[PDB]
């Protein structure tokens, strides 16, 4: 583990060694726009903006990515819902339940599954307004995502319309599935997770054990 | 007949294109006039008059883009992967996969350009005769422009050549980068890469590809 200083809150950013190559523009990019982000109450709170940088990248082969945090109650861990109330994490868990057969569980977290890094493209939003901080995170978001995609084999984005713009880099397998909170798309939502393992050892990589996310 | 044309300063002097390509045609002309002079110094694959013949293709009926990094080092026809005498290993290897998938054992050739819903595409539209990826420096911005235009229409982009498509950025579409068709025994991965395209098309709720349409008897 490592650490850097920034001009505004959260003042300090702790990060895993794998993130070193991009940390120097991150600091420069953040100081430029940080003043704007902190004008607003955010999801998550500033102290939790960068906590996913503590994650290693070399052991990751799948990135499950949403466009930005929950409009409220963000934790800094993408999709995480401590009391298991957010529709997204509830719907994701349902899909995994139908794929694995696990029926009894109390919660689910993408951040405890070997080889998976859960990621939010924009790292904050004005409380209650999705994609409201897109203009600020822009250069940071491209910088970080591109760093992720050189390590992972499969990038799985959630939100067809959410990811309507946004550039990504080759070669990475990239699927844009339906947002977990989207209406009757249970069939396609389920098989999107299922197809990820098929794709992973097309690239001859170990499958993902999605059942590891369950909280009992 | 649903067709248009523009003038460029250098060979092939005229570019014919389908209406679907209109939005990018003025930047194409501006970009091409910039680099054509250096480009034509070289003998190319394909010949200049066949650089842009894929622009005659409609895009509104396309849902899959099968893409190579650039034309064959030699004997390029302007139609991506196409080999009239069926001798290039890429199209021979592609035909095998489709044969293994569909059950068609008897055929004399194969062409991706006769499959409904499929546009075969070369990322760079030419190369110095015998040298792969050699015209990247010229096609650079044209290539980004055209591919981005294709991907706002297709649902699945299937690029062939893991190392070939490194460093290249595209816009969000389901995107698969498979092995180069001419790679040695990656038969399992070559095969299920084509097979998974219809699966992904049905994840996006689009009609499947009839890959057997490519066969020439
Ligand atoms: Cl979140």
Swiss-Prot record, chain B:
It catalyses: Hydrolyzes single-stranded DNA or mismatched double-stranded DNA and polynucleotides, releasing free uracil. Keywords: DNA damage, DNA repair, DNA-binding, Hydrolase. CDD domains: UDG_F1_VAVC_D4-like (cd19372). Its EC number is 3.2.2.27. InterPro entries: Ura-DNA_Glyclase_AS, Uracil-DNA_glycosylase-like_sf. GO terms for biological process: DNA repair. The active site is at residue 70. Changing residue 178 to R: Defective DNA replication, reduced ability to interact with A20. Belongs to the uracil-DNA glycosylase (UDG) superfamily. UNG family. Plays an essential role in viral replication as a component of the DNA polymerase processivity factor. Excises uracil residues from the DNA which can arise as a result of misincorporation of dUMP residues by DNA polymerase or due to deamination of cytosine. This is Uracil-DNA glycosylase. It comes from Vaccinia virus (strain Ankara). The gene is OPG116.
